Amino acid sequence: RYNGLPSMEILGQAAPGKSTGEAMELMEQLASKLPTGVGYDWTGMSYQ
Amino acid sequence: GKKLLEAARAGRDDEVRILMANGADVNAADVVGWTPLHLAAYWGHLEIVEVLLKNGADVNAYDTLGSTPLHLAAHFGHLEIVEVLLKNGADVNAKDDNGITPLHLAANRGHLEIVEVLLKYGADVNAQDKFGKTAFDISINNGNEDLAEILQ
Amino acid sequence: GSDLGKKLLEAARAGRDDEVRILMANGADVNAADVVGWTPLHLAAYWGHLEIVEVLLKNGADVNAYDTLGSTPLHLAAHFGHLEIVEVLLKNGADVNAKDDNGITPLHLAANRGHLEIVEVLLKYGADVNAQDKFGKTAFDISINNGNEDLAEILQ
Amino acid sequence: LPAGATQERTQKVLNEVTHYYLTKEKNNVESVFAVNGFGFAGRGQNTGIAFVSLKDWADRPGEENKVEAITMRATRAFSQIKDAMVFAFNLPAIVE
Amino acid sequence: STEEFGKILLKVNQDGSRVLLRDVAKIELGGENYDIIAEFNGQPASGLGIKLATGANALDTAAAIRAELAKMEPFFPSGLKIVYPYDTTPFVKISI
Amino acid sequence: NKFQLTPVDVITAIKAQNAQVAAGQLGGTPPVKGQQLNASIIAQTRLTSTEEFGKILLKVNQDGSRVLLRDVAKIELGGENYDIIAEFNGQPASGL
Amino acid sequence: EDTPQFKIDIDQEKAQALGVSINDINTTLGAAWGGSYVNDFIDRGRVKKVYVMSEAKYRMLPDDIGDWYVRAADGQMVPFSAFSSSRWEYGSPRLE
Amino acid sequence: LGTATGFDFELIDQAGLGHEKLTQARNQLLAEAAKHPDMLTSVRPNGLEDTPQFKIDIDQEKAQALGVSINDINTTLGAAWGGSYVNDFIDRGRVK
Amino acid sequence: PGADAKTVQDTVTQVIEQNMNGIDNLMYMSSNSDSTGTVQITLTFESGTDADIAQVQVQNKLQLAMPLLPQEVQQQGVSVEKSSSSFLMVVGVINTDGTMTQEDISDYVAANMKDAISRTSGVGDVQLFGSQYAMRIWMNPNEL
Amino acid sequence: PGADAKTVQDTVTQVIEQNMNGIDNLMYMSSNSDSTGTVQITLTFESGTDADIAQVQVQNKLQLAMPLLPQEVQQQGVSVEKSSSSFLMVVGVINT
């Protein structure tokens, strides 16, 4: 659970040549095509 | 009449006078069936009791559970209200829905002179309540030795 | 339990049609089974993967495989409301009246979850409407305990 | 309202308070959020509260359209209401 | 669910018939309590009355609340909307 | 012993008869609309005196006879404990 | 201000005589007219409460008190009216 | 500091979709990610996948009919297969 | 739940109050006990008291009183808060399609919005105007 | 002891989580509940937060949710600890 709601933590990284900034943006982009009611949040190192 | 109920409760002596001068109902009742007479007996307003009675209030009005203004007086030890009510024809032996009399209530709270007064007005010492208890049973159970012999 | 078998058990569960297709071409054991005796067909029936059910059956999967508590793929498909899968299984010979170790049938299970269309399909293919579980309960009994009036009338 | 008062009667009174801001302070009152059963002293069938938000200061020119005159006008209107204590008040500069 | 509570088995009779909870009770979702009922301009509403923690900055906490609210909104059921009936905070920012 | 009783029976009777019971309300929320009466139900309240503790009813004998707390015990106000006794220049005292 | 309250006296002797336990009496009285938080259940993934209480129509009128029954040790159903009595008195709804 | 490589993403159930539905979205997102080897690499769950579990149902009616208490059933199962912490003893002067 | 004011006062309030001692910088203490079943005890401190420590000191005393409280009071949860007494703001929620009732909205708010607003820094207290859903078992004495 | 992941989550984790309110400087909260019968809830605070104040604020909110936890969990106890610290050394003790 994350912030009191059911959650699933996902780890990953940028491909060689890419910035994690770039890789995060694509995740947000992909995350935005998910079914109704699914959200997301950045935690830990990403939050920082 | 709602104003008379409230005034009687508050003890407002002249508000009770004005309101009856202006035609309010002496036997107006609230949600639980209490009359201004019930209210004055409960809080101890001798003057209002006497005024209400002089203006034809039912001295035997009962609430929604069968209790009368004498029950309240005798329960709460208001001696000067108890004699007055009695002098105006209060059912000295009135029972509420529980079978409880004013003598029961006086005996339970240990109001000795009240019991004496209730007795002289002819209270049934043998009167039982729904649990078959007399005032004597109460005096014994409560360990009031004084009261117990006054009931002999 | 073989290697490609393990891969097949996972692919079926995960509903990866393409991987399953390739595995079929390579001869991955369709009769592979995990510790609790689930076959790829159990897994696909459970998680609702229709195509993989069809493909497994094309490739010799035991339509009537049972797990270690006696439950079949039809049990799972009926319980979890997978209508098209229930019909495919029945067409391919699934025992409509199969009882598990508890004497429970696909009909009991469908009725319990209130799956009306599935109940009807199971009755169509000859489900025994009077079948009793180990507690002597029928699907009708299950219907009325649940307070399911629609289903209760279906089972008359 | 007096203790003993029902939830229904507290709603009757809240209706009148809402009505007043909605119809007699159209120029000034933007919204009313009325709560039955909650009051400053805490929960109860006989208690309630209205949170009033006003239109922006620029649309309320003059002393007559400010919180003091508004609440005074409103308390005066509400004083007609039967068997209830109803009053509007500005929260003090600092409170406490 | 209510269905599951309804079929709770209270007892089994002499003739073996079943006494279920739904045989002695009506079973529904409903409030933990029924004392507090809120309207926004006469329309059905709920809300959150927020109190500022001792010594906290009002403007900062208002911001944090707004930011938290924004995260919720996309997942609202249809028609659900946040309104802003009472905020002491804009007066601080604007007056300054 | 004469009454075939133990401290367990005493303790049980006290917990039962020196009780303060939450008994609910007449006409409480959610009510039936139209309800005029709202009143607290008052059941058992804590005992306040040695006389009340004395008449606690331990048991009724088969011959209708009553066995009360005062028939098996002395009842009085007294210290939570008796370990600490103070004197001021020889005279009985207390202190902080 | 003080308001009317419904004072009900449990008769300890009759209760013992009939074989009805004070805990059953008080739980029945309180669960019905006051409500009782039993335990938790799960609603759409969220832990929430479970409450037991009289349906509104059986807890509005004083006469309703006797419609509730407790089971004695010997299996008999005994109406509240058999072991209790009641009276109107005044009490405080908010003690400071 | 604990690993400051890559990103750390939280997929969240914002309505009441539930575990199975959240797994499906996770898988959906994981599928899409793997289609961008050019931008995303080794994108994976930090947690664990679902596993077979032995679901046992107690038949209330048959338990009631045989006169077996649910508490005895559930204590017997839990204590035996799960273990139960009963109380403490003292081993060479240390509580255990 | 279900308690009258005197029951609340004599079974809960007095017990917590008698345990309020050895609290630094306390100017005074007040409380209400009502026939809703509810208690509020307010401890007011000197200006410049650290509110973190005040809250800590109050709760340390309260924990001594807790085992002494009725089981049902404990299970409703008692809380200790450090906040202003007036409202900072009221966040309102409506449904503009009228496809959710007062009760629906209140439950959605309690179940989806309130906790996160309650955990937000600077938020001392949150009142729900409404109520979360609960499983309601409404008994019938005739059938019983 | 003996609890599956969901039992832990739905009788322990959710209850604690619903009580983590009114704590200062919280950035986020995370937890897992697993079939070893374990919950860990980790609350992360703003850099510069006093770690002692954060811990006591968390412990006090927990302490007040303890009566809502299962008896056997209250029995095992619930530990609150600073988590972001690391080991100076590990001393192994073996038998050869």
Residue numbers in the entry:
A (entry chain B): 818 to 865
B (entry chain E): 15 to 166
C (entry chain D): 11 to 166
D (entry chain A): 578 to 673
E (entry chain A): 242 to 337
F (entry chain C): 194 to 289
G (entry chain A): 722 to 817
H (entry chain B): 674 to 769
Task: Give the published text.
The AcrA-AcrB-TolC complex is a secondary active antiport system in Escherichia coli, powered by the electrochemical proton gradient across the inner membrane of this Gram-negative bacterium. Its biological function is to capture cytotoxic compounds from either the periplasmic space or the inner membrane, and to expel them across the outer membrane, into the extracellular medium.
To further assess the proposed proton-relay mechanism and its influence on the conformation of the TM domain, we solved the atomic structures of four AcrB variants, namely K940A, R971A, D407N and D408N, all of which abolish the drug-efflux activity of AcrB. In all cases, the crystal structures represent an asymmetric configuration of the AcrB trimer. Electrostatic calculations for the R971A and D407N crystal structures indicate that, like K940A and D408N, these variants lack the ability to bind and release two protons. In R971A, like in K940A, a first proton is already bound to the protomer in the L and T states (alternating between D407 and D408, respectively) and a second proton binds in the O state. In D407N, like in D408N, only one proton is loaded (on D408), and only in the O state. The R971A and D407N substitutions, however, not only perturb the energetics of the conformational cycle and the transduction of the proton electrochemical gradient, but also seem to preclude the protomers from adopting all the native-like conformations, particularly the T state. In the T state, K940 switches towards D407 (while D408 is protonated), adopting a configuration that is arguably an intermediate between the native T and O states: first, in that K940 retracts away from the repeat interface, unhindered by the now absent repulsion with R971, while still paired with D407; and second, in that as a result D407 loses its hydrogen bond to T978 across the R1-R2 interface. This comparison shows that the T state in the crystal structures of the R971A and D407N mutants is an intermediate between the T and O conformations in wildtype AcrB. The conformation of the O state, however, is largely unaffected by these mutations.
